[PDB]
A = this chain, B = another copy of it.
Amino acid sequence: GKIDKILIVGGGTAGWMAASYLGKALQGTADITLLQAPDIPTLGVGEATIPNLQTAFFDFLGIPEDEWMRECNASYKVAIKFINWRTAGEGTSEARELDGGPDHFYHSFGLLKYHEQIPLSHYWFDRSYRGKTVEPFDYACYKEPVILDANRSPRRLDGSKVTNYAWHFDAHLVADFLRRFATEKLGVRHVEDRVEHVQRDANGNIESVRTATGRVFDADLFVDCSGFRGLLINKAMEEPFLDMSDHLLNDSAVATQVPHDDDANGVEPFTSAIAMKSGWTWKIPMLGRFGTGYVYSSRFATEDEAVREFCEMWHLDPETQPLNRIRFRVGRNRRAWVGNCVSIGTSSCFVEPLESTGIYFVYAALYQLVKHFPDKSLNPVLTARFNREIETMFDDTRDFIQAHFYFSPRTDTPFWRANKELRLADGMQEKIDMYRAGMAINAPASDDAQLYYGNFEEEFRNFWNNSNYYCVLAGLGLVPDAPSPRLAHMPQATESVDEVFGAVKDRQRNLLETLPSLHEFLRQQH
């Protein structure tokens, strides 16, 4: 028979996302309960997202962007801005000078146009390599950088959208919002209780969960949203966790939230990823405040050193500033789903938030869970395919992230040097090989915005694509060995591409002149 009963263990963000998505997907055909025990609450230190959060998650739920944004005090994200990844020095919020300008580059959500079937990146590098341009890749190929430099809104005062964007918010507010939504609109049962004992049967499946009050919860399917502890997937099911520290040295964070006077300084329409001596710091602007965290490697800095260098960066008192000290569990389970137990969220996998993938990993996995939905016979092929989708989503992100450090030119601290001594995974070395040979890496099948950020399957298959790779690699200074050989056979195309770079320049100038500041737009809403 069908799954009748689902027990979600863990509240927080993944828990209530799971409750909401499953509540919606299976509405009226399964009874869902979430077990949540109270925890020491943390500061809201900020979460950055990607555009398909609206199209894959909130639209699936039937929640308009305006409804959730209002309740979560959200702001807009047009790009990640990478600061000081190429220059030596202390951890500072000001960009250093590099070749006549600030040491920054953007990874934005813009689409990279094709010209005559070839991505603009390849024409850019062709001209760069032959000294016909010295303009950075991101300024040449995307309208976004010029308007991000001026803190522009991604929407006009009349509401019309000029660029792809996503969101900055306090995760706690979003979890709250979803808890209200699941319990009130979807009849998800909320039980405040603490897991004391997980009972397994002779097949290794979870039979039930007994709580500290002595209540027993049985279900056909268990969803582990307990975070790093992995109370079901690791403690009960004994599934091993794969530590990825031969690829990823960062395992810790110190974080806080800082009041901000938006009236005096405006709001930045981007996340900042500020390179540090032994890691990097996020800055996630919200309304009246920003979230910030130094992600660092315990192998290269003590907790005290990280605290001191994070506080000094922001001119905060390390003795009195409210701080979150976090030790992460980096990596993934050998298998995300085992028996009748599916892990979702950090109980499944975690990588540092360098590319804003944390929330995405939750709803991407829920999408895959519903796609591979079992009945009570729990057909093993469903479980196996789900696992393969999760493993690829994680490993590809792990690789992509590793490359941000591996290809930094910095040699100034033990941390930056040690990153160059790690190996890239085989699959990543293959992409780098291709990239050096002038190939696109996972070119999107279409340069259409909507078809990509609006159709989840397409986006899941092609999650890190050529645009993403060139932003990061060319950003850091890794470029191909020579221009794509095809281009020498396309003289007309290399002439006419001039008008494509020109149309980018025009949009850059026109948007810079007509767009209001992000702050101007936010005040109008509120």
Which residues in A have some Cβ–Cβ distance to B below 8 Å? 2-3, 25-26, 28-30, 370-375, 379, 381-382, 385, 430, 433-434, 436-439, 443, 445-446, 451, 455, 457-458, 461, 481-482, 485-486, 488-491
Chain B positions within 8 Å of A485 at CB level: 2-3, 373-375, 379, 382
Report how far A373 CA is from B490 CA in the complex, Å.
12
Q: Pick from B26, B374, B381, B437: contact of A381, CB below 8 A.
A: B437
Please name all residues of chain B whose beta carbon is closer than 8 Å to the beta carbon of A482 when the two chains form the complex.
375
Distance in angstroms between the alpha carbons of A25 and B489 in the assembled complex: 8
B28 touches A372 (CB 8 A): no
Other-chain contact of A489, B26, B434, B488 (Cβ < 8 Å): B26
Nearest B residue to A374 via CB reads B485
- Considering the chains assembled together, what is the distance between the CA atoms of A92 and B443 in angstroms? 49
CB-defined contacts of A458 to chain B, threshold 8 Å: 445-446
Given that A385-B434, A437-B382 are known contacts, is A488 also in contact with B445, CB under 8 Å in the complex?
Answer: no
Is B29 a contact of A382 with CB atoms below 8 Å? no
Name A376's closest neighbour in chain B (CB-CB).
B485
Q: Can you report 14 A-B residue pairs in the complex whose CB atoms are below 8 A from each other? A: A2-B488, A2-B489, A3-B485, A29-B490, A29-B491, A373-B486, A373-B489, A374-B485, A375-B482, A379-B438, A381-B434, A381-B437, A385-B434, A445-B457
Q: Give bound CA distance, A25 to B492, whole Å.
A: 12
CB-CB under 8 A from A28, the residues of chain B are: 491
Identical subunits present: 2
**Contacts beyond the supplied A28-B491, A445-B458, A451-B451: 19 A-B pairs with Cβ under 8 Å:** A2-B489, A3-B485, A3-B489, A26-B489, A29-B488, A30-B489, A373-B486, A375-B488, A379-B437, A379-B438, A379-B485, A381-B434, A381-B436, A381-B437, A382-B439, A382-B485, A443-B457, A445-B455, A461-B461
> In the complex, A218 Cα to B433 Cα: how many Å?
30
**Minimum CB distance partner of A383 in chain B:** B437
Give Cα distance in the complex from A433 to B384, angstroms.
Answer: 11
A438 proximity list for chain B (CB < 8 A): 379
**Docked CA distance A436–B380 (Å):** 11
Interface residue from B375, B385, B430, B443 paired with A439 (Cβ < 8 Å): B385
Q: Within 8 Å CB of A2, what residues of B?
A: 485, 488-489
B residues less than 8 Å from A481 (CB atoms): 379
Q: How far is the CA of A465 from the CA of B262 in the complex (A)?
A: 52
* Chain B, residue nearest A25 (CB): B489
Bound state CA distance, A30 and B488, in angstroms? Answer: 10
How distant is A459 from chain B, measured CB to nearest CB, in Å?
Answer: 9
Indicate whether A381 sits within 8 Å of B491 (C-beta atoms), given known contacts A445-B461, A457-B445, A486-B370. no
Q: Looking at A30, A430, A445, which has the most chain B CB atoms within 10 Å of its CB?
A: A445
The complex places the Cα of A268 from the Cα of B373 at a distance, in Å, of 43
Give Cα A375–Cα B486 distance, bound, in whole angstroms: 8
- Minimum CB–CB distance from A6 to chain B (whole Å) comes to 11
Minimum CB–CB distance for A17 against chain B, Å: 18
Inter-chain CA distance A433–B372, complex, in Å, is 13
The minimal Cβ–Cβ distance linking A306 to chain B, given in whole angstroms, is 40
Of all chain B residues, the one with the shortest Cβ separation from A436 is B381
| B residues in contact with A489, CB < 8 Å | 2-3, 25-26, 29-30, 373
**A368 nearest CB across to chain B (Å):** 12
In the bound complex, residues from chain B placing their C-beta under 8 Å from that of A439 are: 372, 381-382, 385
- How far apart are A65's CB and chain B's nearest CB, in angstroms? 21
Distance, CA A493 to CA B381, complexed state (A): 24
A437 to B377, CA, bound (A): 11
Give 5 closest A-B pairs by Cβ, nearest first. Answer: A375-B485, A445-B458, A2-B488, A381-B437, A29-B489
Provide the bound-state CA to CA distance between A445 and B452, in Å.
Answer: 10
Whole-angstrom distance between the alpha carbons of A499 and B113 in the complex? 40
Q: How far is the CA of A336 from the CA of B374 in the complex (A)?
A: 42
Residue of B nearest to A460 (CB): B445
Measured CB to CB, the nearest residue on chain B to A447 is B455
In the bound complex, what is the Cα–Cα distance between A371 and B118 (angstroms)? 9
- CA separation between A457 and B253, bound complex, in Å? 42
User: A381: which B residues are within 8 A, CB to CB?
Assistant: 430, 433-434, 436-437, 439
CB distance from A193 to the nearest CB of B (A): 27
Q: How far is the CB of A370 from chain B (nearest CB, A)?
A: 7
Chain B residue, CB-CB nearest to A443: B457
How far apart sit A436 and B379, CA to CA, in the bound complex (Å)? Answer: 10
Residues of chain B with a CB closer than 8 A to A3's CB:
485, 489
How many angstroms between the C-alpha atoms of A446 and B3 in the bound complex?
29
Which of A29, A438, A457, A485 is the most central at the interface, judged by chain B CB atoms within 10 Å of its CB?
Answer: A485
Least Cβ–Cβ distance between A457 and chain B, in angstroms: 5
**Contacting residues, chain B, for A437 (C-beta < 8 A):** 379, 381-382
Complex Cα gap A430–B439 (Å): 31
